[PDB]
Design a protein around this nucleic acid. Sequence first.
DNA 1: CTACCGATAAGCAGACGATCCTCTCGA
DNA 2: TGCTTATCGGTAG
RNA 3: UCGAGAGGA
Lengths: 97, 178, 87, 112, 171, 559, 278
Amino acid sequence: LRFGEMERDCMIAHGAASFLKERLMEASDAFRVHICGICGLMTVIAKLNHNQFECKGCDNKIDIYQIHIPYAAKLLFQELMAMNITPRLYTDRSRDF
Amino acid sequence: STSTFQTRRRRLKKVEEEENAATLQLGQEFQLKQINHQGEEEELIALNLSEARLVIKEALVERRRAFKRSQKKETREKELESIDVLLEQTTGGNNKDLKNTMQYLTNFSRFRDQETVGAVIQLLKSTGLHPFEVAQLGSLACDTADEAKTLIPSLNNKISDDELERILKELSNLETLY
Amino acid sequence: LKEKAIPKDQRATTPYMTKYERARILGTRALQISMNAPVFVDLEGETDPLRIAMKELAEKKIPLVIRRYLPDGSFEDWSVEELIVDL
Amino acid sequence: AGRAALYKEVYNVIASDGSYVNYRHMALLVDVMTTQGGLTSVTRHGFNRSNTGALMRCSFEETVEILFEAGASAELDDCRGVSENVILGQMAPIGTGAFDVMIDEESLVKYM
Amino acid sequence: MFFIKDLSLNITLHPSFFGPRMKQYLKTKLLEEVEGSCTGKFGYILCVLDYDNIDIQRGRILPTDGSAEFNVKYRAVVFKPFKGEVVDGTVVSCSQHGFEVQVGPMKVFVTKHLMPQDLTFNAGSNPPSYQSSEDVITIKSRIRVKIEGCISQVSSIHAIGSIKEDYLGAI
Amino acid sequence: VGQQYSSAPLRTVKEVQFGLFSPEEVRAISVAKIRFPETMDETQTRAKIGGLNDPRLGSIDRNLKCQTCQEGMNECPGHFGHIDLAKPVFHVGFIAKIKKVCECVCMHCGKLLLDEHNELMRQALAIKDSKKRFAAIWTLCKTKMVCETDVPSEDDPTQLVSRGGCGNTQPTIRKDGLKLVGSWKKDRATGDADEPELRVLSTEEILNIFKHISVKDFTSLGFNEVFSRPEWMILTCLPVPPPPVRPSISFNESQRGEDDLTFKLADILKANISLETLEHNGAPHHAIEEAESLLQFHVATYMDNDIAGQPQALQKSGRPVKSIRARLKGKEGRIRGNLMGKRVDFSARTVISGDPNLELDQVGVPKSIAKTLTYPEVVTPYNIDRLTQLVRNGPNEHPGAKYVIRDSGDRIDLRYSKRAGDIQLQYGWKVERHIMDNDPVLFNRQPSLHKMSMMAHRVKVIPYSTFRLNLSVTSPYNADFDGDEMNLHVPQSEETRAELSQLCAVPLQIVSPQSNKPCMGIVQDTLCGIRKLTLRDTFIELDQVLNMLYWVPDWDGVI
Amino acid sequence: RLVKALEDIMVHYDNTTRNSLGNVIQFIYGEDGMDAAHIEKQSLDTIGGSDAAFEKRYRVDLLNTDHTLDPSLLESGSEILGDLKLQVLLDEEYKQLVKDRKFLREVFVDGEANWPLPVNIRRIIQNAQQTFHIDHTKPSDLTIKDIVLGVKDLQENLLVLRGKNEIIQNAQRDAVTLFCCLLRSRLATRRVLQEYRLTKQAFDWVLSNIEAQFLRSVVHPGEMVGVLAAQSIGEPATQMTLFHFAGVASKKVTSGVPRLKEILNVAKNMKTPSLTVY
DNA sequence: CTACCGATAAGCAGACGATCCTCTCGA
DNA sequence: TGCTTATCGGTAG
RNA sequence: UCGAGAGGA
């Protein structure tokens, strides 16, 4: 069953942050991907056995982070990557505001 | 994963800074003036073979005091065995690298006793030179002024050839007996 | 920017515990009791972790500290003992 | 003087067909429509083109059009909204997620 | 070569350990992972200093799980080398190509080319040796080596040193 | 997780930085070269060619491969490849931006039309925005289309001082489809008499100007120093998306079944391979442009096929190609159809009926729905024996379990499992158990308009395939039992179980904040009866008065 | 369109109504800072009535024989009579009451009293008489100093916004005004005795129960306010449906959803431009 | 009287339009 | 619901 | 799987 726009907005109005995340992630999409600390892109060649976690065009096996993001979101970043747009995912705060 | 202390900012790719050499060109992590957990701007903490030796023992001796508190509710060859047993009481058999370091530090310690070290550190860390240069002066045994200038190239113009020779003879008199 | 942290002295926030704080405290504490975490209150044959999480609050024996964020970025670390449960 | 008449014209639509709406709800949307300087239009041009991050605005109508402009001007999404964390699949700072919770060691020994 | 570096590690602890005997387990889990391990960024993490007075702050709990992220701040000792650093150690491995030297926890190699010509390897000797005139290098024998090159490799830093220079050689 | 353990640290993305792909970094990023326009079969044999699809990237049919990283279909997101463009090509979305930049910054010299000396330039730069600052630059640089060398006369006594390079006239530029044309004037008693000179402006010309543009000139037009540089607005290298983005699918066995973009990208390769030879061999000048325009068209239709004023482009049989713009476009397309609304697991729906013997907060779940739905319960000393009876009762007897997850990631499907009878059950084991009575679970209805419509209902497993519910709770859902269908979503955590029961509960939402009055009340048979009852004219005898008192659940027993 | 516009809007821990960016929309949600579910339609007795009846029901004149409290209402009826010090506080009491009359008439110009306000004080007095079983024949235990100061201390305990500076303190005073005016209107020194006959035990419980019901009635920081407002305005739009207004002649006037399209679009359209002149 | 500064019109496309759910029929 | 682009006529140089 | 039609509260 679809947990559409209307179905999301009501759970927002209630103030239930975890249930909305739970319905959108664990119970739907949910994907564990590796992102670079420098380029901020999923460019990571992550090997879970030989531990070769190198990023081509960074060479590092140090600044690498795993992330719990939806498959549709990852797909959207990949679709925009193919459209010459860089959605460099940054784990650290650089503006605060 | 760790990789903390001197972090931010990585503004895309970066040309890796520069090479790590004994010409004071040290890593982008090891700076002459760095930060602290407290927040203060502290000077680089570099120790020579005799300095570091007593620093690791101080911690491991205190470690055995604390670990056994919760349980309720000298000489050349004798130093080797005492350290060997101390490493077994505080650290696991997994830490092989620590055993090799302790054996090396005790064998090549220029100043075995803490009493001598105090004055040694008050003699070098006063001249007005880089903290790592000290970590090599107190580590390497040098007889000639030109010997010290070759092994530690960071000097050359930093100190006078005669003034350095004055220091070398003092460390010779400060030297421990094995 | 650096540290920020408004101390446990001089606080602009409300001492009353919001329904949202209560629900997170209860949900997470029940999640922990559900993830075999140790219970501080003297349980009385309670099979449900939520039922336990509720009696942990009645006796205020929860070691959870809430970090209530401000719009400027600053934060006020409020404890469950401090926060008055009226609702 | 405009926000009062804007509320007066909004109230008249609700009052004409029975059911009452609490002053606050109507004073709110009106206050969002004015706190910008003038009259913010509730359309693809009025409110949608705002100071907000690239994701918060691409969620409504102008999709790929906004993403292009986001990458052209190198816009930074501060990831502090509803939509962005919803997309990123992260517990958003809304109600229950609007505060982080830690555990105190001082209190752990205090209760045993 | 030895440095006292200030640094921190992020520890995710399971809720089943949330008791009075937690901070002592935080510290133990810390030196289980950090102490003994080697980084290219910092060097050989030898020993964790001051078991007492360790700041842990407060461990924020994760979204859809009872686990808590603790940022344990600590002070430890590191052994980081440099391409030009002159160090004195003991020869361990020896063959026709050259010899390996043990400087602290790090093994440094010296090639037949990086050592003097007026030496040469002696095969007819057990253990394998390198003679010259009266000075002979064996299974032990303490020497002074200049690090010509530094290699990263896994979680174990290795180096390539030379003894062919003035004021170097044997000791 | 997407299965398996990882060594790297997990962290929440606090900010996302946008920009453009540098054709230089794409070459560094790329794992595959991309040469062959064919996809299936190594050399027209079997297992995808080293050209398009898995030359050193995303896995295909039940094979791990994935450029030595393996992991297979599940756990690999795919790895990007690159393709070098024979001649530069404008990006579809930036057609307007490039046109406006060339109309602002003067060519030949490669510098801005306006300088610091102009009072209006100071007024335009004054606002430290990005788009609004550039908006003022667009209107001013629009006119006075000619570069200058000396201009100050009313800031300096009389004499003018040098500031710019070559003072060349900037031409008027208009969009003639996929390419731009600049009209140079002159004509003052010289060539072309009266009518201006028209020159076609190719990508190679525009790109050279954009490369010559100063770093401070970017900031004036609202561009980045490392994220968005004007040189990257014109593609010289194209990144190719991996198979998880453009799937292979392949029905039956010995078939293709490729995605729309897999065919579209091969068409670009076919449009490129022609130029590759045309530029190398005997160049016929006005025959290369006739093919280059086809490549400019092929690259643009791949990203946007909606698209412009006159071109359309289709993939014969007579039906167009699905572009990237149209793939993630609004309403049921990535953003709205897959990220603001998703079809979710552990849900139910059936025709709704009313009941007076149910509580306001209760919901009448059919026995099959509770049996075909499971909640994860971790093995603690508070359950164990309870779960032990659920495990042995299995997936057939209503109070049972379907899957038993161990300490390590392993599911024990009791419907199949040979050891279904035994099972010792170790501590800290998740048990996918059937939905029991008095369970707080989210009860939905479409359309979900106001805060209500989605309330938490105290589960009651009952027979007959229909969603039963209280009669007084019909007003917050605004529906009637004339065949209305309602959704249900079962929570999967102890956190979300409390976040529902202690926030979304039916009595918590009794008083509507919309009008500061309750949204629920006694209606129909209950409403009609209370009027008949509450009056002086009617009385009740002893025989019926005791049953009346007995019907009250909260009765003292005092007559 | 409405919910996508007011997505980011949420009450903060500093009682303010901001958004994702951090801009201020409302400094105190709904001007009063109350949780919409904790409010009832209550009548104000200060604005309603003639100046002659208002003088009779609220004025306490100890320095008079006919305009004083009869000792059948108060324990200390005779000794309170003709006092100078006690009447000073009852001059302060009535001058604060006459302040509310001129201020409420400045606000509710139409004369409407039945306004949405938190804490059912009308029910708290009803419930007080039941809780203590108070009779009208016997006098109260309290004195004038107990009543007039009891309400004075009560107005201070009502903390909407927590402050320390001149701005938040003046913002706190603005946030209450209308409510503490209703409180002055309902807990007048004479009204307590003449109408309710409340004892010291009853009145003290009433002040404590009023502040408790008022602190419960404050908004919950995290409430999605704008998202909730969008649905609370969006939902009635589906129910309308149905133009003529006469009346009060207004036949060719745009009403409901077609009128709403213009308001939300804006879009300078003519439709119903009919301006009102006085 | 001419050159310039802004005025109003001529010409003129854009992209959005309830939420969910059921089923068949091709090419 | 906007935007875009010529034509116009006017003050002062 | 895509596209078209029919029907529901």
